[PDB]
Amino acid sequence: HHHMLENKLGIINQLELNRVEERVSKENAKRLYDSGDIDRIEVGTFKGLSYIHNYLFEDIYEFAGKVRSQNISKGNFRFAPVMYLEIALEHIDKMPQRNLDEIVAKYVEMNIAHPFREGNGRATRIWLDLILKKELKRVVDWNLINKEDYLSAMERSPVKDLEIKYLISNALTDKINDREIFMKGIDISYYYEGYTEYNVDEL
Amino acid sequence: HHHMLENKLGIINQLELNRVEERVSKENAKRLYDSGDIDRIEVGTFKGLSYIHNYLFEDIYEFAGKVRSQNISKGNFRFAPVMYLEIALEHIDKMPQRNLDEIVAKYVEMNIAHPFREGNGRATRIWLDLILKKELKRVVDWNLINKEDYLSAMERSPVKDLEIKYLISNALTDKINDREIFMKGIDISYYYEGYTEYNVDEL
Amino acid sequence: HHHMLENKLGIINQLELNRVEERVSKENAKRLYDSGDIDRIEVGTFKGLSYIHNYLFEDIYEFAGKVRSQNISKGNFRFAPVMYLEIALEHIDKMPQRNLDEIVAKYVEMNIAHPFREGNGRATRIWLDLILKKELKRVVDWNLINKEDYLSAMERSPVKDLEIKYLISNALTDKINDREIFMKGIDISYYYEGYTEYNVDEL
Amino acid sequence: HHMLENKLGIINQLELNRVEERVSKENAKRLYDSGDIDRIEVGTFKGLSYIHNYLFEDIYEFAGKVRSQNISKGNFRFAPVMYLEIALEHIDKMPQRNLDEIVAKYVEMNIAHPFREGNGRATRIWLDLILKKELKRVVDWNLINKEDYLSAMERSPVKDLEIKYLISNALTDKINDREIFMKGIDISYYYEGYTEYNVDEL
Amino acid sequence: HHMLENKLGIINQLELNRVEERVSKENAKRLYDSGDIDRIEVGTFKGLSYIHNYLFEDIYEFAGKVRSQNISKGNFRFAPVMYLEIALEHIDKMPQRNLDEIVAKYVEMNIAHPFREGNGRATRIWLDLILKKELKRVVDWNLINKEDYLSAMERSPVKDLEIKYLISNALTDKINDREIFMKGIDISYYYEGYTEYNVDEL
Amino acid sequence: HHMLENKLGIINQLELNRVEERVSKENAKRLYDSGDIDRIEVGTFKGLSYIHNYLFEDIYEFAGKVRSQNISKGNFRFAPVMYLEIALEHIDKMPQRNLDEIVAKYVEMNIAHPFREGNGRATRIWLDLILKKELKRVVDWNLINKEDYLSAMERSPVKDLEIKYLISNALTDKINDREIFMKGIDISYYYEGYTEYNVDEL
Ligand SMILES: Nc1ncnc2c1ncn2[C@@H]1O[C@H](COP(=O)(O)OP(=O)(O)O)[C@@H](O)[C@H]1O
Ligand SMILES: Nc1ncnc2c1ncn2[C@@H]1O[C@H](COP(=O)(O)OP(=O)(O)O)[C@@H](O)[C@H]1O
Ligand SMILES: Nc1ncnc2c1ncn2[C@@H]1O[C@H](COP(=O)(O)OP(=O)(O)O)[C@@H](O)[C@H]1O
Ligand SMILES: Nc1ncnc2c1ncn2[C@@H]1O[C@H](COP(=O)(O)OP(=O)(O)O)[C@@H](O)[C@H]1O
Ligand SMILES: Nc1ncnc2c1ncn2[C@@H]1O[C@H](COP(=O)(O)OP(=O)(O)O)[C@@H](O)[C@H]1O
Ligand SMILES: Nc1ncnc2c1ncn2[C@@H]1O[C@H](COP(=O)(O)OP(=O)(O)O)[C@@H](O)[C@H]1O
Ligand SMILES: [Ca+2]
Ligand SMILES: [Ca+2]
Ligand SMILES: [Ca+2]
Ligand SMILES: [Ca+2]
Ligand SMILES: [Ca+2]
Ligand SMILES: [Ca+2]
Ligand SMILES: [Ca+2]
Ligand SMILES: [Ca+2]
Ligand SMILES: [Ca+2]
Ligand SMILES: [Ca+2]
Ligand SMILES: [Ca+2]
Ligand SMILES: [Ca+2]
């Protein structure tokens, strides 16, 4: 099934499975940074996002890095249905990214596409930071964006992106090669989704 | 200062604040159970829920156990306006709880009321288990309800409580004095809300 | 439970129960008209609506004529919460009914209140015809309002009442003492709710 | 669209409803008792179209054909005509190996809502055929309460847990039982507001 | 996107709004008085694009061209850019033989919302052309209250009865009356919050 | 008879709009230049009612008075008449010590929407008075684009974050600057579709 570690380690408690998946994927995130692999990823495309997703979740989620084949929703919002996900990703690949407005709009469209069965939030926040670094020489200090504010802004974003754009704009930092900003952002990004067991840099 | 530990322990990292609040409130939950205090609470009333909330969150959330003074929402759903909280809680105190249909309806209305600024989910799930134990001689084995299923069902519940009802009925157990069921349920209930650092029985 | 005939007569097929409830309640509607009792009902108040509802559904619906104690919804519209239902009804009793605009607004508010667990549509349409008869010397020729148009307009009416006002306006007739108009209207009103087995004037 | 309204000069909504119920239920009874139902392609729009035409030929104009107008129920907009064809192309390729996949496929076909009218009844017959082929089960529709079913279908474009739960709990292995089929036709029609006839009495 | 903001260095929103109103209403008056409006393809996106460019080429970047950004009003998300082409080609093939079909076509074109801005005013001109050609009618827009029209358009993706009713009760056979056209331009701009000028005084 | 300036026969919506703008903007200018604005209770429905009456008596029937009908915009239903009074009572007791509390109070007053019309313009004047008293700030409304403001207000019953950001970045310490007040009146009316007059030229 989708959680490849669930049967492998015979785990029947939701919290223990959550902790193990957090540990493995954060190990992978730490390696992605410390190996320098994060600097050799295509920026602003679904190919780069797919690479990030596979890197984080290979041997954790079945078909990591590959588009889902099932329709999904959060709250009352239906993400792009599978039937046109391909064309959605093509359109996102050609969207411009020369200023904060365009980059945030591109991030919002990629969240609407929501191409994977799981792991969209964490992978796409890494992807967004790479776009911001390449184009604005900034990255997000994610700790400066309150979790509940971020989630509300993303819920609002398919209709209007002003909330998420304001939060991102006020969280930007020029410390784009600072390892500490990256690792703290990984921990905050995982906390957004309900993973709080590990610090990435202690793995 | 709603997060009373933030200034007291000078915490500037969201994840660190989340972890300390989890530890303190889970210590309080373990004490609530092991002291037998949980057995001397009024069942199915706002008095009992307020007692549970204060017990869990005193010196963590300002005004623990007391009704909020601000309006709040999650997703697209606006909880009961502050101006009607009093009458909402009065109505809920009068709701019957003789079978699963009525108990689930009462739980759904209490979630709609959402009387506290924070901590509604965890406190109200403890409260619900007490109602089920008293009236049906059952409690919920929360690990049998998947987190995303639970959250979607609660989002659905103000419109129809069928989704939540099924989840609950399929998770009921007669092990109403099983400490392991209670503690595992505390851990799963906190996991529902994004706290995964501690096991309650290890504190 | 709520359908008293299910346990009373041990009917476990939904369609058979539906047919028996249609027969009994249409017998009651026919008696309500032919006895002249309909002419001695208070017009435009919840007292009159409750009298109609009890008359139709006594020994069919538990607590016929009495306000519901649980919250209900249709589609994604939540009708008036129980916690202020009485206040809503007290407001509706004082709403004016001097012309078509005001009568339609009053009908729309009564549908929002939706005071009974079931039977709101049929009872409140009888109630509305009485208001129109008293104040405008008109009643609705319900066959002139298409079922799907009526249902769509009622779904729209809590936001804007133009659709339902238009349909009603176009279907008004001055034959306010014509028995065939009344009986045909009973049949169409039940057809709106999915009852098609009987003609009321054949009972 | 209602071809019988002009033909029999009917001006009462309820009598038109009754005549359409009688004729289409006669067609459903024939579909089962003639054995035609057993040679319908399972799980494709081709099969659904065959069912819809069989039921509603000379009742609905263009029975068996995709609608050309957009439609909605409540505040839910069904698949726009502009990509309906594509929506059907995708549904034909959806897997149907377990209850999860079959329910997801049924939910997508309901979202597509390919016909002007008659989507509910035709697609419930279609769903039973899929369940019969892949799970050796069919739905005992009387075990699914009408209001629960309608609410679950309203919920299903967002989350299909409600409808999945209801279907799962209503499955029976009596996949060639004529009474189960006929009662299911009557309950399926009752869902949509037709209560005049019992199909096996026609 | 607003070319006149940088061109005339305007930093007051109201001042910019007035200048955009004046320039586009001058263009609308010329579109009518030159007879150019009579030589536009009726009922197609090509004609709508011509109207939009004619009104706004000096005001909006890429006037007459489909937008490249996704947009929304209220809680309604208009057709995604990725589908605009297929949506517009579908709209080009929609019939327009009676009021039902014409209103449905207008509703779909509003859902498509092909331009970044100016959809309301341009598409109302386009709609009158269709009504003039096919029904020998145009809309007397002053007979449709602004708030009723806006609510009806908000409702129209779900059900088009409100807007159909308003349009039907506002139709006039004065299809060549210059004052009906000019007053309609003024009312159409008023719908969108431009009230500074009368078009026929420019 | 709600639009007191209206008459019998067909009225032109645009001219009525212009006349109502002129009269109410004259009243707003007088409210400021007479110093009457300085004598208004701050942060209460009493003060809001005074503002609404001052702007709109002889324009709207029952200016300064609570509406008696339920109203909606988009798909949002404002506070029902049935509890409007309790809601205003609650709003009178809400704190206003910082921007978070003041924006929350403004958002609740907009949800209450106590008047039949004129809620936007009157309540924005009211909000500026609260901000002036408690923060020594007012809004430079020209710094908030119309479409951003309207979207943020649509969002505000769910989350006030959008509107709070816009207000926060538009605050100015020029709390007794006549230019800021008059420009803000013009922008506030522009938000609602009135663009004919400049207030200080009346
Ligand atoms: N209601 C919503 N509408 C749109 N986007 C949402 C909604 N809720 C959450 N999101 C986005 O989806 C992300 C979570 O996606 P998910 O697939 O669960 O990723 P992960 O596995 O990393 O948690 C959130 O971080 C947020 O960006
Ligand atoms: N969209 C929603 N609609 C209704 N109820 C919700 C929604 N989202 C979450 N909930 C309920 O609110 C609870 C969380 O409330 P919250 O005040 O955050 O408590 P806690 O501090 O324990 O997390 C969830 O457990 C769920 O039951
Ligand atoms: N989505 C909706 N929103 C508001 N009102 C509705 C909606 N759907 C139906 N209604 C109204 O509710 C009535 C049905 O009420 P119900 O309690 O089912 O009465 P009955 O038992 O007579 O069918 C319909 O006739 C219609 O007037
Ligand atoms: N709001 C909704 N959202 C999604 N699906 C719905 C909604 N309302 C009804 N449905 C589905 O549509 C079906 C009815 O479609 P319809 O075309 O009217 O068929 P029929 O002519 O057989 O009644 C229902 O059985 C239900 O499955
Ligand atoms: N919530 C909504 N849903 C659907 N359509 C809408 C909505 N709000 C406005 N519209 C339509 O959009 C038009 C406005 O489009 P816009 O691109 O702003 O045109 P303009 O620049 O001419 O004002 C309105 O006239 C109305 O027809
Ligand atoms: N959909 C909506 N939801 C919440 N608030 C809204 C919505 N639409 C408009 N508003 C608020 O209502 C105001 C308009 O109120 P209205 O009574 O028309 O006042 P006015 O007569 O001054 O224009 C807007 O300025 C905005 O603040
Ligand atoms: Ca997540
Ligand atoms: Ca740890
Ligand atoms: Ca929570
Ligand atoms: Ca730990
Ligand atoms: Ca009904
Ligand atoms: Ca019969
Ligand atoms: Ca139907
Ligand atoms: Ca019969
Ligand atoms: Ca506009
Ligand atoms: Ca002028
Ligand atoms: Ca307005
Ligand atoms: Ca002027």
Short mmCIF file of N, CA and C in Angstrom, two decimals, chain C residues 126-163:
data_model
loop_
_atom_site.label_atom_id
_atom_site.label_comp_id
_atom_site.label_asym_id
_atom_site.label_seq_id
_atom_site.Cartn_x
_atom_site.Cartn_y
_atom_site.Cartn_z
N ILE C 126 -49.04 24.61 2.37
CA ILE C 126 -50.44 24.84 2.75
C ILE C 126 -50.58 26.17 3.50
N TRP C 127 -49.69 26.40 4.46
CA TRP C 127 -49.67 27.63 5.25
C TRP C 127 -49.54 28.88 4.37
N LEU C 128 -48.64 28.82 3.39
CA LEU C 128 -48.46 29.92 2.45
C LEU C 128 -49.72 30.18 1.64
N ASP C 129 -50.37 29.12 1.15
CA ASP C 129 -51.61 29.33 0.41
C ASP C 129 -52.65 30.04 1.27
N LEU C 130 -52.71 29.71 2.56
CA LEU C 130 -53.66 30.41 3.42
C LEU C 130 -53.31 31.89 3.56
N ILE C 131 -52.01 32.21 3.69
CA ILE C 131 -51.61 33.62 3.79
C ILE C 131 -51.99 34.37 2.52
N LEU C 132 -51.67 33.79 1.36
CA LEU C 132 -52.00 34.41 0.08
C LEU C 132 -53.50 34.59 -0.09
N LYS C 133 -54.29 33.58 0.32
CA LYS C 133 -55.74 33.68 0.21
C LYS C 133 -56.27 34.83 1.05
N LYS C 134 -55.80 34.94 2.30
CA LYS C 134 -56.28 36.00 3.17
C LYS C 134 -55.88 37.38 2.65
N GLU C 135 -54.62 37.55 2.24
CA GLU C 135 -54.09 38.89 2.03
C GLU C 135 -54.16 39.36 0.59
N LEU C 136 -54.11 38.46 -0.39
CA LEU C 136 -54.12 38.83 -1.79
C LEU C 136 -55.33 38.32 -2.54
N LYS C 137 -56.18 37.50 -1.91
CA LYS C 137 -57.26 36.79 -2.57
C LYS C 137 -56.73 35.97 -3.74
N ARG C 138 -55.58 35.32 -3.52
CA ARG C 138 -54.97 34.41 -4.47
C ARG C 138 -54.51 33.15 -3.75
N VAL C 139 -54.37 32.06 -4.51
CA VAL C 139 -53.63 30.89 -4.07
C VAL C 139 -52.74 30.46 -5.23
N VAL C 140 -51.81 29.54 -4.95
CA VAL C 140 -50.89 29.05 -5.96
C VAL C 140 -51.52 27.87 -6.69
N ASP C 141 -51.48 27.92 -8.02
CA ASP C 141 -51.75 26.75 -8.86
C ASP C 141 -50.42 26.02 -9.02
N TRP C 142 -50.15 25.09 -8.09
CA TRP C 142 -48.81 24.52 -7.98
C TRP C 142 -48.39 23.76 -9.23
N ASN C 143 -49.34 23.21 -9.99
CA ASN C 143 -48.97 22.55 -11.23
C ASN C 143 -48.30 23.50 -12.22
N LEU C 144 -48.53 24.81 -12.08
CA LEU C 144 -47.87 25.78 -12.95
C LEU C 144 -46.43 26.08 -12.53
N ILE C 145 -45.95 25.53 -11.43
CA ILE C 145 -44.55 25.67 -11.02
C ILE C 145 -43.88 24.32 -11.18
N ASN C 146 -42.95 24.25 -12.14
CA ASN C 146 -42.17 23.04 -12.37
C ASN C 146 -41.41 22.63 -11.11
N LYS C 147 -41.40 21.31 -10.84
CA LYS C 147 -40.78 20.79 -9.62
C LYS C 147 -39.32 21.22 -9.49
N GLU C 148 -38.53 21.03 -10.55
CA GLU C 148 -37.11 21.35 -10.46
C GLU C 148 -36.88 22.86 -10.35
N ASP C 149 -37.69 23.67 -11.04
CA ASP C 149 -37.62 25.12 -10.86
C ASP C 149 -37.93 25.51 -9.42
N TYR C 150 -38.99 24.93 -8.85
CA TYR C 150 -39.34 25.23 -7.47
C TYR C 150 -38.20 24.87 -6.53
N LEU C 151 -37.65 23.67 -6.67
CA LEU C 151 -36.59 23.25 -5.75
C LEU C 151 -35.35 24.13 -5.90
N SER C 152 -34.96 24.45 -7.14
CA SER C 152 -33.81 25.34 -7.34
C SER C 152 -34.06 26.72 -6.73
N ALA C 153 -35.27 27.26 -6.90
CA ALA C 153 -35.59 28.57 -6.36
C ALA C 153 -35.56 28.57 -4.83
N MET C 154 -36.03 27.48 -4.21
CA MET C 154 -35.99 27.41 -2.75
C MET C 154 -34.56 27.29 -2.26
N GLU C 155 -33.72 26.53 -2.98
CA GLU C 155 -32.30 26.48 -2.65
C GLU C 155 -31.65 27.86 -2.73
N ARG C 156 -32.05 28.66 -3.72
CA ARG C 156 -31.49 30.00 -3.90
C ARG C 156 -32.05 31.01 -2.89
N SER C 157 -33.27 30.78 -2.39
CA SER C 157 -34.00 31.83 -1.68
C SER C 157 -33.34 32.38 -0.41
N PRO C 158 -32.58 31.63 0.40
CA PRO C 158 -31.93 32.28 1.56
C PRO C 158 -30.98 33.40 1.17
N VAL C 159 -30.47 33.40 -0.05
CA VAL C 159 -29.58 34.45 -0.54
C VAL C 159 -30.35 35.53 -1.31
N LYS C 160 -31.20 35.11 -2.26
CA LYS C 160 -32.06 36.01 -3.03
C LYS C 160 -33.37 35.30 -3.33
N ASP C 161 -34.49 35.98 -3.11
CA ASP C 161 -35.80 35.38 -3.28
C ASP C 161 -36.46 35.71 -4.62
N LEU C 162 -35.71 36.24 -5.59
CA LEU C 162 -36.31 36.64 -6.87
C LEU C 162 -36.90 35.44 -7.62
N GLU C 163 -36.16 34.33 -7.67
CA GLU C 163 -36.63 33.15 -8.41
C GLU C 163 -37.97 32.65 -7.89
#
